[PDB]
Amino acid sequence: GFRKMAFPSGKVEGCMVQVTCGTTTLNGLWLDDTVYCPRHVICTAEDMLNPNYEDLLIRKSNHSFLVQAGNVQLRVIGHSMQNCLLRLKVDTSNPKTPKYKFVRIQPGQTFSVLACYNGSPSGVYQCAMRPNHTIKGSFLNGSCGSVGFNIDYDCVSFCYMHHMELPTGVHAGTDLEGKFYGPFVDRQTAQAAGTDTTITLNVLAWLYAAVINGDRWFLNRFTTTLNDFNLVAMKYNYEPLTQDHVDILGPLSAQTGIAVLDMCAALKELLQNGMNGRTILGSTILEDEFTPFDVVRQC
Amino acid sequence: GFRKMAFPSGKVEGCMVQVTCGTTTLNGLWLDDTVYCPRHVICTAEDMLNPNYEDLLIRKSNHSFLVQAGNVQLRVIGHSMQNCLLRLKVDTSNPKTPKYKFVRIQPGQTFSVLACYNGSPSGVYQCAMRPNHTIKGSFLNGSCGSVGFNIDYDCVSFCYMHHMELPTGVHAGTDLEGKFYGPFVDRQTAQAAGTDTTITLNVLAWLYAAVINGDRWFLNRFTTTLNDFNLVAMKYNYEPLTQDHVDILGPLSAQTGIAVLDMCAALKELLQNGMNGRTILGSTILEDEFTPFDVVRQC
Ligand SMILES: *[C@@H](C(=O)N(CCC(N)=O)NC(=O)[C@H](Cc1ccccc1)NC(=O)[C@H](CC(C)C)NC(=O)OCc1ccccc1)[C@H](O)C(=O)OCC
Ligand SMILES: *[C@@H](C(=O)N(CCC(N)=O)NC(=O)[C@H](Cc1ccccc1)NC(=O)[C@H](CC(C)C)NC(=O)OCc1ccccc1)[C@H](O)C(=O)OCC
User: Fold this and answer.
1) Most buried among A140, A179, B184, B232, by the most CB within 10 A?
2) For residue B182, how far is its CA from the centre of ligand 1 (angstroms)?
3) What separation in Å is there between the alpha carbon of B173 and the centre of ligand 2?
4) Pick from B286, B284, B252, B293: which is nearest to B267 by CA?
5) Beta-strand relationship, B100-102 and A100-102
6) CA torsion B70→B76→B80→B86, rounded to 10°?
7) CA of B183, closest CA in chain A: separation in Å?
8) Dihedrals φ, ψ of A223, to 5°?
9) Which letter does DSSP use for residue B125 in this model?
């Protein structure tokens, strides 16, 4: 009984619109009287390579942007750019605008994604920002403009807007200020993602989730120093854990009574001597897409 | 009595060499039997724009790399690339190699820079990784290959190698695995740095340094919520403070007896109603290049 769960998506659902320029349609986010969407809505087929966006934008009329909420057009009366996003000023304030913030997320942090085509929601899934600033999503042509978010009590924190699919089939996007996560750019030029690594802080959190859920077999038989843990773990392509991360595990260490370095030690033995044929929470493989915050949430 | 201080530079001084290819000479770092240096040592004048480094490297002989420690050549017997760095295998193990680690640093963290020309040290200064992944250094033509570092007890943590000067006169570089900090690339093409912001976590730390040093006038007359602090501060181009940062100030909050949100409140009033004609630690301006760790260190 421990599962990836998404946030309920209803509050974000009533912000989703479609935005069409020419023959190209993608998703936008409608909040108050603004629609946010990827500025590549404005590109034609023959210049996705080196689009001059500010030149393409300045020659475009308000009327060229067809914005629809369901069957209902929303007249665009302003447009401007914000980094890699467009802000379109519309007709009408979204009567469904929830309480919201725009947040820029850190590598390792998880959010829910509401996957959309043609302004309509298809599904919600939970994922993470990877150490290499990509995300492992599930997105098809037309997904661009889909948003990632977290929700606390009554406030939607928007953190992600989908822009690109990499050659390896992972994904890249921006915050809601239009700023890319990672060294990526919105044009179809040859780029390169960093080698990815395992989110160590998250794998520990999920080992704490296991203990809380009653799973104890892998508890540590040997001791470790922070440094000695890092020397082994890096070899398995795990992120270095810093003292800042150690400090992040304090509350789960306090609630379980397992010192953070004792769990670091369990993790080392797991990697080395392993489950080999064993499971933790019913899982082969060490799960690295739950934060300390998610564990505390769902437990 | 509170000053920017650099780490003593002696341990890093005996790692500094010069590396010359053709007519181009820069600095390298000699540890054990490897010299690390920026791979742009290999570029000629007419292709700094789009250097094909792996092609330029593969056609280069070991002998083309002239490496000198003082007056003394060190024969290069291997070369390879690692991201934006070269690793040259040499003759001789540095008898002056200290205890060391390679660390990748976070925005906001400070290190000392040992500025070098032609393998010789000229000066040391303390600085920070900016939220926009540049550094505000003092570097002239030939500085490339200079290193940033921290030292704890007896171990040198290398974090930075200098590569580029931006149009605005700030600076860009890599970790010691050759990976750029920030979305920058080592070629003289048109690029762009993010708008920079003030390191909030650091300005608070420096207000704690003030209290410890006996400066109390600006202590808060009104209260604040984390959120309400952020709403004001962002307006002054300060980074958002997260709960993770709040947690980082715990020990200085414990040692001074000033709750972190009380200091957040002081900072808000300072920004709004201000020192206007007043000083804190003898400073006009709020200093944002000391970490919580530096304050605790020098206090
Ligand atoms: C928009 C859309 O749905 N998506 C995502 C589709 C998906 N499977 O996730 N976005 C795109 O398809 C991008 C459109 C675009 C963006 C900017 C400028 C021009 C066009 N294009 C890509 O994602 C493209 C996919 C190709 C199959 C390669 N990505 C790249 O070029 O990768 C660059 C790169 C990154 C890192 C390493 C190497 C290379 C829908 O396509 C749409 O409406 O487009 C309007 C133009
Ligand atoms: C190496 C050297 O000393 N420095 C730094 C000098 C300093 N003042 O800090 N490095 C360079 O000069 C870079 C050399 C280089 C790097 C890669 C490929 C080719 C050459 N060049 C630059 O720093 C250059 C400076 C020009 C005056 C603009 N920078 C850029 O091109 O900026 C790119 C950019 C970034 C962000 C926004 C916009 C643009 C010494 O120069 C040497 O030995 O060179 C060997 C080639």
Assistant:
1) B184
2) 22
3) 10
4) B286
5) unpaired
6) 10
7) 4
8) -105, 165
9) E
Say whether B248 and A244 touch across the interface (CB within 8 A). Answer: yes
Domains of chain B in start order, with CATH, are 1-13+99-196 (2.40.10.10), 14-98 (2.40.10.10), 197-299 (1.10.1840.10)
Q: What is the DSSP string of B251-293?
A: HHHHHHT--HHHHHHHHHHHHHT--TT--BTTBSS---S--HH
The structure tokens listed for A151 are 């929700």
Cβ pair B123, B115 in contact under 8 A: yes
Strand partners, B87: B36, B80
CB of B40 closer than 6 angstroms to any ligand 2 atom: yes
Experimental technique behind these coordinates: X-ray
Which two structure tokens, joined as six digits, stand for A127? 């994922």
d(CA B30, CA B219): 48
CB proximity B183 to A under 8 Å:
yes
Q: Which residues of A touch B179 (CB under 8 A)?
A: 194
Tokens, residue A233: 């773990």
User: How far is the CA of B215 from the CAs of A217, B175, B198, in angstroms?
Assistant: 54, 37, 22
What's the CA gap between A243 and A246, in Å, rounded?
5
CA of A296 to the centre of ligand 1 (A): 36
Q: 3-class DSSP state for residue A62?
A: helix
- Cβ distance A166 to A134 under 8 Å? yes
Which residue in B has a C-alpha nearest to residue A107's C-alpha? Answer: B106
Helix pair B200-212, B260-272: axis angle to 10 deg: 100
Q: For the residues of B157-189, what is the DSSP string, one character each?
A: EEEEEEEEE-TTS-EEEE-TTSPBSSS--SSSS
| A183 lies within 8 A of chain B by CB | yes
Q: Which residue has the tokens 């780029």?
A: A191
